[PDB]
Every structure is written in structure tokens, then in C-alpha cells.
Amino acid sequence: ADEGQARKSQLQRRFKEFLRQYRVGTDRTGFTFKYRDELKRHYNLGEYWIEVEMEDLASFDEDLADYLYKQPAEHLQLLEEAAKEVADEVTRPRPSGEEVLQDIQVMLKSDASPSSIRSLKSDMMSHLVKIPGIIIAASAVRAKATRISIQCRSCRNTLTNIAMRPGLEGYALPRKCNCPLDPYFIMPDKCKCVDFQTLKLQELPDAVPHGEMPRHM
Amino acid sequence: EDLKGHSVREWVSMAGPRLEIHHRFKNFLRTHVDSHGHNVFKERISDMCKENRESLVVNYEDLAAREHVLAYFLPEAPAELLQIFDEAALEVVLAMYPKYDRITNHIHVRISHLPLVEELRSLRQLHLNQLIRTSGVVTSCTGVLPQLSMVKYNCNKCNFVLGPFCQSQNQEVKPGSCPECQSAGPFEVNMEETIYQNYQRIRIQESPGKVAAGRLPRSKDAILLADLVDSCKPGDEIELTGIYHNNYDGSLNTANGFPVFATVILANHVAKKDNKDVKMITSLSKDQQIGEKIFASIAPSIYGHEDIKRGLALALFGGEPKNPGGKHKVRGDINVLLCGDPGTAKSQFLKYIEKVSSRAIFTTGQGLTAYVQRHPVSREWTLEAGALVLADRGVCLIDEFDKMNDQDRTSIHEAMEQQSISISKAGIVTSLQARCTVIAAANPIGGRYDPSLTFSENVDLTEPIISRFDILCVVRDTVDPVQDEMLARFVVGSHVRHHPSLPQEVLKKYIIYAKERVHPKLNQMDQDKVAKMYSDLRKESMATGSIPITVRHIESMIRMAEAHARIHLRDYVIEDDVNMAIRVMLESFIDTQKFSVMRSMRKTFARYLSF
Ligand SMILES: [Zn+2]
Ligand SMILES: [Zn+2]
């Protein structure tokens, strides 16, 4: 428990030294800081996303790019919280109209051989996978509360800044106000929202074992 | 003594008998030779480890031979013996391959052919919790869903994960109160430490004609766990082997009015029952005269018709599906269309090709494409395969071609020259594949084919459809005296030796072999040997009331070019089988002609082509 945050404050510091130090190019020609420059050039345009590459992360610090393959959930958070502390010491002082620091959605690509939908055995639960396919559907974008704040009903006590977890998982509202049993409601005025879609991915046509209809995810 | 006065379930659960059984199984695993001095479970475990399969087969008969006591304990309380055998086979493998811990760290032993094959309607309450072997078709299968195996929650008030409870397939697991903050409440799972396992549910039902004699066919459920999932598809014939396990349901109790429980077979071994060296074939193909010797191997009973035997043999192996370099997508499928008066063994020609071929299907014309269907088991409105996608590489045997409906007719033609279907149905918009060769037989109008008119009249078929067929054989009848005895004697004798008081081995393995190990080539010495015929015959036909050999006949001829590359392994185009290709492509055209033209064109060409 107390070693949890003490590990994190040592991972969120080694994920920050990766963006801040990784270079490319040789010594004869000349170098190029690959991710500071993209952070700056994407922030100043108003985009807020970098595209980290897994081979680079592996070649810089070999342990991190393994955690990221095994526990991607609780480590993408540290990565996206270091991308926000680096995009702060690079673009500041922001000129006039913006002075609140945005949030950086760290995507990530790779150059590794793809699996297939028929090779998703349950031992791959919560591991980065990489599958090809064909989009078959597309929902309409919706909202998804990220940082939500509630309020009691009778005594009007507030308990704010509550953070939702990402993905498709809800939240369990308390029942112990400290007032009737479940006195808590959501305050619609104070809840930050982000978009979210929901696609449908069909497996490539030349990989069906040819007795049936292709499966999808 | 390994048999004392308790319940077989509770004898084996005691520490003493447990350890005795544990050690007893190892000695059989390590030391068991089979009629040649081979430790079978030394090579078999190896062949399992060369593939990362975590599933070991134990034939029951040998277990009974080398072990008299376990093969009697087994089908009495198999929910624990099949657990002890797991830990035995583990410690054996981790000795024959000490690193295998990096592959799944868990072994399941299947069991092959218990001696008690059974029916699916004769399962009564006597068999609750007893190993069982059955049979029957499977008629559904859900998707491979993941199920909890070793769940582990986490408390909402203390950030501490509760105990790793195991999941039993009858009741949702129930965690107690947090031993760290006594915060009894609605815990949620912890997706990171929980272990999952594959899962699939199928609905098996009695075989069609086997036992369903004068009643309706019953059915049962089955649950395939981790390694077994996707061992069988709707339509397969399997034979389960699994504990017959019951569980309480609250709905049946509210319909039947009595306390009634549901039952399900926790499958333990699934073995399909369906249809799945050259040094002879070298000289057998080098006979140089394999044509005659193979023609009279198909159509084994039906006498005569060595004409249509030729065409159908050409069709069976096929041709060569070359891809034109100009993006024109020529097809490599031979489609046939029989026709003739009733009573001439057309349907038998269809049924025998059902057998001899492979991956074949069948249908009547009185279901052709994928359609929305409410699943028997899953109760979801899925999409099911039709009858032209189940021959995506083999053959499609159509019967009663005339009786097709307008939708069926407008759907059959699309797949001929495109071989690809789209389905924008209520389910979802897809575009699948269909590469099949069509073998159908129509009927003559007026109850008899009369060759005064063209064939395009007695067939009763839409005209751009007949063009989508390569061969057009016309069957008829004969009253010749000398053949009456020949056919009679044959039928009578075939009724003498069928009742309870090249063979079928060379050509099946041969359609398997010759399908694969040939890739016919195409030179350009025949490219001008044919045009000298076309320039003549086009005029010869257009002169009268007919349309000459057109490009869609040259395509069929050039397809049947390679039709003999599969029989001879020749694979090189020569001016020899071009004499055959042109001969056949005119054989299937002079018959579909007029009264005096079917003979005038004969007097010209049948004497011209130097048959
Ligand atoms: Zn309150
Ligand atoms: Zn707790």
C-alpha cells in the first residue's frame, strides 16, 4: 500500500526521463530530440497527443517496455501523467489565452507481428494485443464522465473530484453520507466529459478456417 | 486393501487412498509397453510437448488391463479421480521436460472409448455424476466466452484484495466480509489477478436416422472448457464423454409444478466421427492408358453412359483456376447440367458423386444463402450458413433444378461468374466467398425430351443461365434388344447379392493426391491449332439456325485442357489432349441442336474432326 505510491513515484520518474532524453540520428550527421519536439509542435497546434513507439521505449529502458506489455492498465496512467509534466516544462510560458495545462492522450504504435482474433485465448486477459481486421460498424460518439462530483440530498454534503476509471466500468455510489440510505446524486454542472465511440472489428477474410461466418470483436 | 466399507466417492477422498491412487497412476504412466516394447506414454507425451497442447489421452482399455482397481473406481466418482490423474501426469511431464512450466502449468487427461456407448434418450437419474459416453449431432455453439476460474475481489473501503475463491459451475461465488475492515458490501472483481478459462456451450441431439425410429429426437446440453472449445461445428457428428451433472433451476419448477432440476454434460473428450505412398502412383499414372481404367471406376453400378462418365470425370478433379494477368478473373470450376427423361439414373449420378468426392454438400430445388436464424441453444438471432457457402472449395449438388424460385434463380446466377455473395440482411452487411462447382440435373418438359426443338426448349430454363454451364449432357432412353439383356442381367444380379443372406481405395486417395501435387503449365504451341477450327465452324453454324461455338465455349475447352493434367500428372499442354478438349467441347454442343442440324453438323465435323 505504502510501497505502491513509492514505486509509482519512481516509475512516473523513469517514464518522464524517457520522453525528455530519447534522441535519434547518428553523430556524423546530427541528432534530434524525438518526443520533446513532437510534444511542443502538437501542443502549440492544439492537438494534445503524441505517438510513442514501443521499440524506442524498449531500447531506452528494457524493464519499462515489459511492464507495459504485462500491466498496461496501471502503467499507461503513469506514462500519460509524465507526458503532462513534460509538456509543461516545454511549452511554458503559455501566451495569454491558455494557462491551464491540458491532458495528453498518449497513443502508441509498434512494429511487431500481429495476432488474430482466433488466437485470443483467455490467458491474454489484460495484456497488450495487436490484431488486424476490418471495421464493420461505428456507433455515434457519446460522452463519458471522467472526473465526477457528487452531492448528498438531505444534508447537502459534497464529496467532489472523484475520478472514474477508464474503459467500460461504472462507479459504486456510497450509502453512508456522514440522511437516508443512498442520499447521493450527481451534479450535472460539475462533471468533465470526453467523447467515446464503439466500433466493431471483423476478422480478415483470408483467415477464416472456412466452414462458417467470420467472428468479430 | 484398496476397497473398504465406505462410499466410493468418500473412499477416494481420504488421504490414504488418495496417496495410494496417486502413486499407482505414476507407475502405469511410466511403464506401459504395447505389443512391441514401446513405452507409449513416453513417445505420446513427447508428441504432446512438441506442440504445447496440455491434454493427454488415456485409452481406457489399457488402463483396465494394466490396472484392475482404478478402471473400476473411475466411472463411479470421476470428479476426483480425473483430478488426481492430473497431478500425476504433471509430475511425469515436468520430469520428462523440466522447463515445461513455462507452458500452461496444468495438464488434463482425457479418456478414450469407455466400453459403454449409449443412447441420448436413455439417460435416467441413475447416471447422475457418472462418466458417460454418448453420440449424436451437434446443432448449436455459442462463441468462446471467458469464464472466471480463480476469482479474486477487492474491498471498496480498504484497498485489499479478498481471497482467491474458485468458481463452480452451478452457483455464483460468494465472498464473505472483509477480514481487514469488516466492510461487508458489494465487492467487484479484480481483472488483473483473476484467472480465466475458455468456455463454450453446445446442444447435442440424437442422430437423425440412428435411433429416432418412430418418435421425436431428444437433445442435451454440453459444456466444453478450456482446451476443448471449437472442437465441433453445427452439423458435425461427435461422441461426447463426460460427467452427467445436474443443477437446480428455478424456472422449470415454476412450469412443471414439481421440484425439477436441469442436467448438462460436462464434456471430457470429444472425438468427431466424420470424413477427414506415391511410389505406386508413379507407374500407375505412367501406364499412359489410365483414362479407360479410371472412366469405368466412377458410376460403379449404372450400366452404359461411358459418354457422360467422361464429362463427369473431367469435372470431378476439375481443371486449373489460373489468374489472368489482365484482371479478368477467369474461373477454374467445371459446372455440369444433366437432362433427360425420367428413369435414367440421374439422381444416382448425383448421389454417388456425393460419396466419392470430398467436402461435398447436397440440396434439392423444390436455404441457398446465409439467413438469419434464432439459435436453438443461445437464443440469439444469429446468421447461419446457406448451401452455396458450405461448398466454398468443393462441389454443390443441386437437384430438381427446375423447381427453383425466382429469388433462387436470381441468386444462383450471381455466384457463377463472380463466385462471391453479399448479404445486406437484417443481421449485418457482409461479403463472403463462394467457390463451388455446380452439378445439377433438370427435367424435360412434357415428360419426355424430344429432339425436334433445340435443347434450350425442353429444358425450361432461363437462357443466360445455360451459358453459365460448361458441359451440356443430354440423357435419353433405348429399346435396343441386345442391350436389354445387358442391363437386365446387371440389375437382377445386383439384387441377388445385396440382402442379409479401380476400387474405392485407389481413386479416393488419388483425388486427394492428384488434387495437390500438380500445377499444370501453359505453353503457346496450341494457340493456333484451334483457330483453324473456329474460323470454319463459326460459319458452319451461323449458316443455319444456330449460334456457333462462342468464347464461353473456348473458355470451357481451355478449362478442360488441364482436366487431364490431374489424371496423367502430365501438367504440360500438348496437341494430344487438345484433340480431346476440342472433341469434348463439340460433344457438348452437337447434341443441343435441331433435328436435321444435329446430323448435318455431324456429317461435317464428326467426320472432319477425325474422332
Ligand atoms: Zn447527508
Ligand atoms: Zn476491506
Curated annotation (Swiss-Prot), chain A:
Protein name stated in the entry: DNA replication licensing factor MCM5
Function: Acts as a component of the MCM2-7 complex (MCM complex) which is the replicative helicase essential for 'once per cell cycle' DNA replication initiation and elongation in eukaryotic cells. Core component of CDC45-MCM-GINS (CMG) helicase, the molecular machine that unwinds template DNA during replication, and around which the replisome is built.
Family: Belongs to the MCM family.
Gene source species: Homo sapiens
Subunit annotation: Component of the MCM2-7 complex. The complex forms a toroidal hexameric ring with the proposed subunit order MCM2-MCM6-MCM4-MCM7-MCM3-MCM5. Component of the CMG helicase complex, a hexameric ring of related MCM2-7 subunits stabilized by CDC45 and the tetrameric GINS complex. Interacts with ANKRD17. Interacts with MCMBP. Interacts with TONSL; the interaction is direct.
Cell compartment(s), UniProt: Nucleus; Chromosome
Domain of life, per lineage: Eukaryota
Pathological association: Meier-Gorlin syndrome 8: A form of Meier-Gorlin syndrome, a syndrome characterized by bilateral microtia, aplasia/hypoplasia of the patellae, and severe intrauterine and postnatal growth retardation with short stature and poor weight gain. Additional clinical findings include anomalies of cranial sutures, microcephaly, apparently low-set and simple ears, microstomia, full lips, highly arched or cleft palate, micrognathia, genitourinary tract anomalies, and various skeletal anomalies.
Additional notes on this entry: Early fractionation of eukaryotic MCM proteins yielded a variety of dimeric, trimeric and tetrameric complexes with unclear biological significance. The MCM2-7 hexamer is the proposed physiological active complex.
UniProtKB/Swiss-Prot annotation, chain B:
Ranges spanned by the short sequence motif Arginine finger, renumbered to the chain: 467-470
Keywords per UniProt: Acetylation, ATP-binding, Cell cycle, Chromosome, Deafness, Disease variant, DNA replication, DNA-binding, Helicase, Hydrolase, Isopeptide bond, Metal-binding, Non-syndromic deafness, Nucleotide-binding, Nucleus, Phosphoprotein, Ubl conjugation, Zinc, Zinc-finger
Domain of life: Eukaryota
Start and end residues of each MCM domain: 290-491
Post-translational modification as stated in the protein's UniProt record: Phosphorylation by the CDC7-DBF4 complex during G1/S phase is required for the initiation of DNA replication.
N6-acetyllysine modification, residue list: 42
Substrates-to-products reaction catalysed: ATP + H2O = ADP + phosphate + H(+)
One of the protein's GO biological processes: DNA replication initiation
Keyword Mitochondrion part of the UniProt annotation: no
Location of cross-link Glycyl lysine isopeptide (Lys-Gly) (interchain with G-Cter in SUMO2): 4
Family: Belongs to the MCM family.
Protein name: DNA replication licensing factor MCM2
